Design a protein around this ligand. Structure first.
Ligand code: BCL
Ligand code: BCL
Ligand code: BCL
Ligand code: BCL
Ligand SMILES: CC[C@H]1c2cc3[nH]c4c(c3C)C(=O)[C@H](C(=O)OC)c4c3nc(cc4[nH]c(cc(n2)[C@@H]1C)c(C(C)=O)c4C)[C@@H](C)[C@@H]3CCC(=O)OC/C=C(/C)CCC[C@H](C)CCC[C@H](C)CCCC(C)C
Ligand SMILES: CC[C@H]1c2cc3[nH]c4c(c3C)C(=O)[C@H](C(=O)OC)c4c3nc(cc4[nH]c(cc(n2)[C@@H]1C)c(C(C)=O)c4C)[C@@H](C)[C@@H]3CCC(=O)OC/C=C(\C)CCC[C@H](C)CCC[C@H](C)CCCC(C)C
Ligand SMILES: COC1=C(OC)C(=O)C(C/C=C(\C)CC/C=C(\C)CC/C=C(\C)CC/C=C(\C)CC/C=C(\C)CC/C=C(\C)CC/C=C(\C)CC/C=C(\C)CC/C=C(\C)CCC=C(C)C)=C(C)C1=O
Ligand SMILES: CCCCCCCC/C=C/CCCCCCCC(=O)OC[C@H](O)CO
Ligand SMILES: CCCCCCCC/C=C\CCCCCCCC(=O)OC[C@H](O)CO
Ligand SMILES: CCCCCCCCCCCC[N+](C)(C)[O-]
Ligand SMILES: CCCCCCCCCCCC[N+](C)(C)[O-]
Ligand SMILES: CCCCCCCCCCCC[N+](C)(C)[O-]
Ligand SMILES: CCCCCCCCCCCC[N+](C)(C)[O-]
Ligand SMILES: CCCCCCCCCCCC[N+](C)(C)[O-]
Ligand SMILES: CCCCCCCCCCCC[N+](C)(C)[O-]
Ligand SMILES: CCCCCCCCCCCC[N+](C)(C)[O-]
Ligand SMILES: [Fe+3]
Lengths: 270, 302, 240
């Protein structure tokens, strides 16, 4: 089915690959070649997760866990049940995420809109790849990657974290967190501001963007503007994920010791 | 480069914008500050005016008194020497009273008394600031969403520094005023409580903190992607849907099977962000008062 | 429900489901109910009901919007269904850029200018904007405008600015016959010597829709202008 206004937009064109071969929809979803690619990568990776579940012996999704190969396997392939399934699932994962982003590009082109969304999605994909690829290759073993399980991958975060003391002292970690917190603060304020203008006090007409600017000038003495807040929100969330990947790419690879001592570049100056 | 609307190409200026008046007491408005062409590449160039009423003066004064209460304590820990001050600034810490002083305000100034003085100043600065966020909207005839969202952050800061310490029986449970020390407080908090990763409200808090970066990346990119159709003029798109709002919605419908409206996306947004500190405050509040060990708590439930 | 932590977490999950259900219906105030490709309503609408209407009171006597309500494009759509089966593209039945379909689409917005907080036209050419001028970056007025065919379509004779938000939104461009068209600021690249437009070739500027007044632009006109320009990315692509 279609939204009431959707039909005029459902024209041919915009594909990157296949011409009009995959230029169609299934319900709301656009397909395209990379929609077919996403479906194949996602279905296969989901099947191997299903088969890694029978090998583990559970159907409880809180217990299923697909582990990367033992650290000794280095950067080499592994038998299915000892890191191989993880290895193939990681390939399908990467395939689906990349296909998804390319499908998004085809959608942008058919709609005539900027490409900011798949570009932003790419930051998330490079953060995933930082953890399952760039860092494990830098360090020489697939086993430095996180396991695919709801709770096991949190254990991975705690294990990895406390191997380097208090990660809190990693300066790139501090920057990433600052961006994450500032982002949620900006999101809350941006959502609140628009809603407070579209839904003013009872007995009032709709406010205008001028009221939004006035409110934040009155409040903090500066208004970034309607365009700026969307630039800022993109910049905050992407910078959060960039510095997250940077804090991990510099971890185990260029930095090996406990993080609290990074700072005595400062406190033990003569 | 095909233009990406991330930096203004041509800045323009007219008479400085003094703002909507509505019911704002214009007495308490500052003059306009200087224009920053640097800021104007990314957002507005105009600085000011700002509003400073009774509440704003109170919160500012009380806020500076909080800062200077921690400042003088940092100088005393630095033996009043400007070199050790600048060197160890991240290491100084104004700590709460020790657990023996309980919930008492009799702790001496040098082992908890000054923390209590600071906390009082901070409590007045924050709550009068919150009244400001309510009154600044009210004066303009706007909804109270900002004050309401701000309450969510305040809830967490209140649980950490005041509500949970009180339910625990001592100020010693509260957060120290220091850069590195409060990080250490955070780490040790999770250790003494059996790993915060197993506090399911901490897991929700994280999902919403991640989800906030997800949604803002999605929404910021979307609006920039349709700015070529006036998409960032979201209020008029709400009152009179244009092709920006339609193409924005169809991008997401065609991508993930469903979509928002120009208005509705800001409800997703406010709730995504507010839930961060809402769930977080709950999880902290249950820690030590109801649940001593989250991992052990987690194992017996399922 | 064991202890208070268990009751709390179970409660929060029931609340979150309530919240998601509310949030989703709030986001069905435009475009719903879903329709089949012939414009009749679809059988399965999903498990979320349509929201009860809400009203916005537009300022400056411009009336009230109630949503959801009866939807209509309020314009002819020059496209034709291709397949008996649903899910296939529809075919433009004319010039999609002149007809406004596909990525050239526009919405039948109100044929009135957006007003600022004081009830005055929000977007005004500088020549009628009491006090306005350029403050940083390359002043584009007077520079030539170039298309994706690398030919010159005209010259920038002004700038249409957002008066309350103090921003540049359109370049007014004079064509060879002495008439003007507005170009969306987000679709141009102002360089040292030129203003490059990659969406249109030089000869597609004259087809940019025109405005009734020399010092005001309606929302309808803006939609028409911005959709046409963006639609060039797909429909002027043989020339690029
Ligand atoms: C959530 C669980 C923990 C916690 C865990 C962490 C972790 C983990 C990190 C921080 C980080 C920071 N935290 Mg902390 N933090 C907590 C509670 C607090 C409280 C409070 C009112 O309770 C405050 C004021 C702070 C303040 C700070 C900042 C110093 C810094 C960036 C925050 C941010 O992005 O703000 C968003 C808001 C804005 C950008 C606008 C306002 C900005 C200013 C800077 C806010 C801080 C004021 C501060 C008093 C000024 C210090 C001045 C210098 C010492 C001279 N935290 C609780 C107890 N916090 C990060 C850091 O860099 O630490 C060194 C970091 O890595
Ligand atoms: C005990 C644990 C340690 C610690 C150790 C670590 C370790 C170890 C790491 C971090 C990392 C991070 N930590 Mg730390 N950290 C600690 C304390 C904190 C505190 C705090 C309040 O004290 C905070 C706020 C943070 C904050 C953060 C962020 C900066 C960052 C996580 C986000 C990220 O990278 O996203 C990036 C986003 C992603 C990876 C998501 C990618 C998603 C992909 C592209 C697509 C998914 C599609 C999906 C499968 C589709 C499914 C189906 C559909 C839903 C329908 N840490 C303590 C001291 N921290 C991580 C990091 O930087 O990673 C790079 C990391 O690895
Ligand atoms: C980012 C830095 C760290 C990390 C640290 C943490 C910490 C710390 C926590 C989580 C939490 C979660 N993380 Mg993790 N996590 C990482 C990488 C991932 C990746 C990935 C492919 O990169 C995925 C899919 C997840 C997924 C998840 C969820 C189980 C959960 C909620 C996240 C959320 O809402 O995010 C924002 C996104 C959204 C709101 C959109 C919806 C996302 C959906 C719900 C993801 C579901 C994934 C699904 C279960 C698995 C694939 C399904 C296939 C059908 C097989 N994490 C890396 C290693 N993650 C929290 C939790 O409660 O864990 C139990 C938690 O406390
Ligand atoms: C070793 C560390 C422990 C741990 C210990 C804790 C503790 C302890 C806490 C958190 C909390 C949080 N943790 Mg944890 N956390 C760990 C691992 C992680 C990881 C990770 C990938 O490893 C991540 C992503 C997170 C993520 C998070 C967030 C979801 C959450 C904080 C929300 C927030 O906005 O706070 C920041 C926002 C605030 C503090 C509110 C501030 C409001 C006040 C009013 C602002 C006043 C400003 C003041 C006036 C300054 C003036 C300056 C002006 C500029 C003038 N944790 C491990 C297990 N985490 C919190 C939580 O809610 O837990 C359930 C918490 O208390
Ligand atoms: C949804 C939850 C998120 C959230 C929401 C949120 N926060 C909010 C709001 C909202 C909706 C507000 O409305 C409110 C606000 O006004 O924002 C602009 C606020 C805000 N959140 C802030 C901070 C903040 N929020 C945080 C977090 C979050 N806030 C969550 C992630 C964090 C952290 C640690 O993550 C911080 C630090 C403030 C900027 C602001 C509330 C302002 C306030 O209470 O101020 C007290 C008043 C003072 C005067 C403070 C003391 C003064 C300084 C210490 C001065 C020191 C400098 C020196 C003296 C300089 C001056 C001299 C020179 C100029 C010469
Ligand atoms: C870079 C800034 C933030 C960001 C941005 C971002 N994410 C995005 C986008 C953008 C701009 C999209 O356009 C895209 C989207 O469509 O969102 C609706 C996406 C998206 N971000 C998603 C998730 C996500 N994003 C996250 C984070 C972030 N996304 C960043 C903080 C997180 C976390 C943990 O923080 C998650 C979980 C999806 C909702 C979506 C990507 C959907 C997608 O790729 O679909 C195709 C793939 C599948 C349907 C399934 C593939 C399955 C695999 C083959 C098997 C599973 C393998 C996996 C490794 C298992 C993990 C196990 C866990 C227990 C750890
Ligand atoms: C102003 O504009 C804006 C809107 O519009 C007006 C919007 O909508 C949105 C979009 C934002 C929302 C609707 C808010 C809600 C979104 C979130 C809370 C973020 C988290 C999102 C999810 C958890 C949804 C996840 C669902 C996914 C990833 C797709 C689900 C997959 C299927 C069921 C089928 C998969 C389809 C495939 C594999 C493609 C191939 C298809 C074949 C048939 C083959 C934004 C940002 C916006 O800014
Ligand atoms: C020249 C003299 C001027 C002095 C210059 C130095 C001032 C630096 C202040 C740092 C505060 C540290 C803030 C970081 C952590 C704060 C956490 C917090 O507020 O905790 C909640 C508390 O328990 C309930 O109020
Ligand atoms: C005493 C406190 C001093 C505080 C000093 C600055 C605080 C900056 C905090 C967060 C950044 C997010 C700020 C911008 C969030 C605005 C939300 C929004 O929509 O504003 C856009 C524009 O101003 C309307 O059109
Ligand atoms: C794209 C990310 C790459 C992650 C892992 C790639 C390792 C390749 C190993 C091949 C698997 C060996 N096998 C089939 C026997 O399991
Ligand atoms: C990023 C937020 C900080 C911005 C605060 C700036 C407020 C400007 C007030 C200037 C006062 C003008 N004056 C001196 C005539 O009153
Ligand atoms: C978060 C605030 C970021 C604002 C910083 C602005 C950086 C200056 C960018 C100048 C742009 C140069 N140019 C040629 C593209 O106009
Ligand atoms: C308002 C947007 C709704 C987003 C939904 C977020 C759900 C995340 C679920 C994570 C589960 C955490 N935990 C501890 C219960 O497992
Ligand atoms: C694992 C938890 C994450 C669940 C979030 C996925 C939501 C999918 C909803 C897609 C709706 C598609 N459809 C056909 C109903 O339009
Ligand atoms: C949610 C707040 C309710 C707190 C109940 C009273 C707290 C006082 C301390 C009780 C000790 C809790 N205990 C015995 C499980 O550790
Ligand atoms: C994890 C939070 C995201 C929850 C996703 C909500 C799914 C909404 C499904 C909307 C149904 C689409 N439909 C059929 C009404 O058009
Ligand atoms: Fe917005």
């Amino acid at each position: 089915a279609l939204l009431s206004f959707e039909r005029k937009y459902r024209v041919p064109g915009g594909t990157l690959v296949g011409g009009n071969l995959f230029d169609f929809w299934v319900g709301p979803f656009y397909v395209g070649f990379f929609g077919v690619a996403t479906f194949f990568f996602a279905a296969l990776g989901i099947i191997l997760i299903a088969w890694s579940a029978v090998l583990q012996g559970t159907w409880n999704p809180q217990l299923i866990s697909v582990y990367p190969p033992a650290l000794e396997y280095g950067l080499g392939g592994a038998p299915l049940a000892k890191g191989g399934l993880w290895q193939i699932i990681t390939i399908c994962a990467t395939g689906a995420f990349v296909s998804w982003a390319l499908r998004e590009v085809e959608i942008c082109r058919k709609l005539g809109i900027g490409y900011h969304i798949p570009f932003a999605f790419a930051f998330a994909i490079l953060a995933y790849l930082t953890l399952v690829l760039f860092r494990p290759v830098m360090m020489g073993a697939w086993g430095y990657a996180f396991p695919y399980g709801i709770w096991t991958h949190l254990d991975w975060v705690s294990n990895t974290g406390y191997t380097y003391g208090n990660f809190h002292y990693n300066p790139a970690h501090m920057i990433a967190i600052t961006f994450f917190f500032t982002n949620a603060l900006a999101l809350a304020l941006h959502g609140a501001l628009v809603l407070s203008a579209a839904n003013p006090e009872k007995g009032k007409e709709m406010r205008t963007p001028d009221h939004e600017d006035t409110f934040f000038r009155d409040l903090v003495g500066y208004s970034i503007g309607t365009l700026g807040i969307h630039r800022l929100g993109l910049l905050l969330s992407l910078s959060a994920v960039f510095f997250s990947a940077l804090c991990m790419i510099i971890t185990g690879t260029i930095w090996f010791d406990q993080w609290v001592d990074w700072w005595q570049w400062w406190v033990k100056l003569p | 480069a095909e233009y990406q609307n991330i930096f203004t190409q041509v800045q323009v200026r007219g008479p400085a914008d003094l703002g909507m008046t509505e019911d704002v007491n214009l007495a308490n408005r500052s003059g306009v500050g200087p224009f920053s062409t640097l800021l104007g590449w990314f957002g507005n160039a105009q600085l000011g005016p700002i509003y400073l009423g009774s509440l704003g003066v109170l919160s500012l004064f009380s806020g500076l008194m909080w800062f200077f209460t921690i400042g003088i304590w940092f100088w005393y820990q630095a033996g009043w020497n400007p070199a050790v001050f600048l060197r160890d600034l991240f290491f100084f810490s104004l700590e709460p009273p020790a657990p023996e002083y309980g919930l008492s305000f009799a702790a001496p100034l040098k082992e908890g008394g000054l923390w209590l003085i600071a906390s009082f100043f901070m409590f007045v600065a924050v709550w009068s600031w919150w009244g400001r966020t309510y009154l600044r909207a009210q004066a303009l005839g706007m909804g109270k969403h900002t004050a309401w969202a701000f309450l969510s952050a305040i809830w967490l800061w209140m649980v950490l520094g005041f509500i949970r310490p009180i339910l625990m029986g001592s100020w010693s449970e509260a957060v120290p005023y220091g850069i590195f020390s409060h990080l250490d407080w955070t780490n040790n908090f999770s250790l003494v409580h059996g790993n915060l990763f197993y506090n399911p409200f901490h897991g929700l808090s994280i999902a919403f903190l991640y989800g906030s970066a997800l949604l803002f990346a999605m929404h910021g990119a979307t609006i920039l992607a349709v700015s070529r159709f006036g998409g960032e003029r979201e209020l008029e798109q709400i009152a009179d849907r244009g092709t920006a709002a339609e193409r924005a919605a169809l991008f997401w419908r065609w991508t993930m099977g469903f979509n928002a409206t120009m208005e509705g996306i800001h409800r997703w947004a406010i709730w995504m962000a507010v839930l961060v500190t809402l769930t977080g405050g709950i999880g902290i509040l249950l820690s030590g008062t109801v649940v001593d060990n989250w991992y052990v708590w987690g194992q017996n439930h399922g | 429900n064991f202890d208070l932590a268990s009751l709390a977490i179970y409660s929060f999950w029931i609340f979150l489901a309530g919240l998601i259900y509310y949030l989703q219906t709030e986001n069905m105030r435009e475009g719903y109910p879903l329709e089949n490709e012939d414009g009749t309503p679809a059988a399965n609408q999903g498990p979320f009901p349509l929201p009860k209407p809400k009203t916005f009171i537009l300022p400056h006597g411009r009336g009230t919007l109630t949503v959801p309500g009866p939807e209509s494009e309020d314009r002819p759509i020059a496209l034709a269904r291709t397949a008996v089966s649903e899910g296939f593209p529809h075919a433009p039945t004319g010039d999609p850029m002149k007809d406004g379909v596909g990525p050239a689409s526009w919405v039948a917005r109100r044929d009135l200018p957006e007003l600022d907080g004081h009830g005055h036209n929000k977007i005004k050419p500088m020549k009628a904007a009491a006090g306005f001028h350029v403050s940083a970056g390359k002043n584009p007025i007077g520079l030539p405008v170039r298309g994706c065919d690398l030919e010159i379509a005209g010259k920038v004779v002004d700038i249409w600015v957002d008066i309350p938000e103090q921003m540049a939104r359109f370049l007014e461009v004079e064509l060879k016959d002495g008439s003007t068209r507005l170009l969306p600021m987000q679709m141009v690249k102002v360089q040292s010597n030129r203003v490059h437009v990659n969406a249109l070739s030089s000869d597609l500027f004259a087809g940019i829709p025109t405005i009734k007044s020399p010092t005001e632009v309606t929302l309808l006109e803006e939609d028409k202008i911005c959709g046409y320009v963006a639609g060039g990315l797909m429909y002027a692509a043989p020339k690029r």
